[PDB]
Amino acid sequence: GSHNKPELLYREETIETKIDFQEEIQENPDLAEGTVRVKQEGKLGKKVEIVRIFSVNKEEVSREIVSTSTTAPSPRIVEKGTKK
Numbered sequence: 294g295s296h297n298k299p300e301l302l303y304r305e306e307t308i309e310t311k312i313d314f315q316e317e318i319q320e321n322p323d324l325a326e327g328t329v330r331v332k333q334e335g336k337l338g339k340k341v342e343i344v345r346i347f348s349v350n351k352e353e354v355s356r357e358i359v360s361t362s363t364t365a366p367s368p369r370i371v372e373k374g375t376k377k
Contacts, residue, residue, distance in 0.1 A: 295352035304346040305359060312338030314366035324374030335369025 314335055324330060343359040 295350040297350055299350045302346075302348040302351075304348065306344055306346065308340075308342040308344070310340045310342075312340060312364070312366040314338070315368040316371075317368065318371045318373055320375045320377065321372040322375055322377045324372060326374050326376050328372075328374030330372040330374075331370070332372050333367060333370035336367035338366030339364045 314337060316335065319332075321328075321330070341362045341364070343361065344356055345359050346356050347354045
């Protein structure tokens with residue numbers, strides 16, 4: 294019970310969490326033995342969560358999610374030349 298003039302506030306916040314990716318190395322007979330060639334570049338993703346904070350009289354009441362969006366990570370794939 295905040296002891297002041299009632300006031301409705303809507304504080305919106307954006308949460309961004311980086312998403313880790315996996316790594317895998319595969320053999321490629323088509324390449325010369327020892328050859329290193331990246332098939333897929335390793336990149337981090339991001340989970341975005343936008344929320345709205347409802348406060349009344351400088352006093353937090355409740356929260357509600359405005360919008361979310363998840364960017365998928367990019368696992369890193371590297372080819373290794375061989376003789377098979």
